[PDB]
Curated annotation (Swiss-Prot):
Protein name: 2,3,4,5-tetrahydropyridine-2,6-dicarboxylate N-acetyltransferase
Similarity comment text for this entry: Belongs to the transferase hexapeptide repeat family. DapH subfamily.
Entry function: Catalyzes the transfer of an acetyl group from acetyl-CoA to tetrahydrodipicolinate.
Range within the parent protein: 5 to 88 of 239
Organism from which the protein derives: Staphylococcus aureus (strain Mu50 / ATCC 700699)
Amino acid sequence: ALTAEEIIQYISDAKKFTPIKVYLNGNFEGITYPESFKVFGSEQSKVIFCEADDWKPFYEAYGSQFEDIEIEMDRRNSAIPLKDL
Ligand code: NA
């Protein structure tokens, strides 16, 4: 299906990004989220899909209003497509 050339081009393009997924409990009032953030959840518990490079300074800034945290690297960091799209 995909050629070796197409695969390494894909890896070259994709590897720049480091999507992660963060589970949080806490208070989310008075927070502005970076552009890479896609925030799901309820008033006092979130799941955030975001870029690692944005997560780091965000946590340093706002981490005092979070009470529990779990961080996962998104599986797309190690995915190659089976076909093009
Ligand atoms: Na990556």
